[PDB]
Amino acid sequence: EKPYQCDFKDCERRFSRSDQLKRHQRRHTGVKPFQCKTCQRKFSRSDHLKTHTRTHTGEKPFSCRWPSCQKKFARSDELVRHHNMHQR
DNA sequence: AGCGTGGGCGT
DNA sequence: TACGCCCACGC
Ligand SMILES: [Zn+2]
Ligand SMILES: [Zn+2]
Ligand SMILES: [Zn+2]
């Protein structure tokens, strides 16, 4: 079920997919294939580079649904936390 | 609050 | 293999 096993020293992680293992292993090696064209910072993952680029443009695609709240967020998890706060 | 950066997952 | 989504933890 999880045949892709990490063999790095002291690590026991295993994964269902080979790409998960490959992505995981960049945390051991420090390899960062993806670079921001704006600030030259490098990243282990293409999706994290994409949300990072938002920090330069101010793009915030996720809006609070609460009436009379104008708050919006770059990422969906920021909005999840925000909505959780409204109800609490 | 904003965001790096793992995870699991869908396509 | 690629791309990118949501979930969360930890500053
Ligand atoms: Zn490992
Ligand atoms: Zn940048
Ligand atoms: Zn709100």
Residue numbers in the entry: 350 to 437
Question: What did the published study say regarding this structure?
Answer:
We investigated the response of the zinc finger DNA-binding domains of transcription factors early growth response protein 1 (Egr1) and Wilms tumor protein 1 (WT1) to different forms of modified cytosine within their recognition sequence, 5′-GCG(T/G)GGGCG-3′. The three ZnFs of both proteins bind in the major DNA groove. The C-terminal fingers (ZnF3 of Egr1 and ZnF4 of WT1) interact with the 5′ triplet (GCG), the middle fingers (Egr1-ZnF2 and WT1-ZnF3) interact with the central triplet (TGG), and the N-terminal fingers (Egr1-ZnF1 and WT1-ZnF2) interact with the 3′ triplet (modified GCG). We kept both strands of the 5′ GCG triplet in an unmodified state and modified both strands of the 3′ GCG triplet.
The principle difference between the two WT1 ZnFs is the residue at position −4, which is E in the low-affinity ZnF4 and Q in the high-affinity ZnF2.
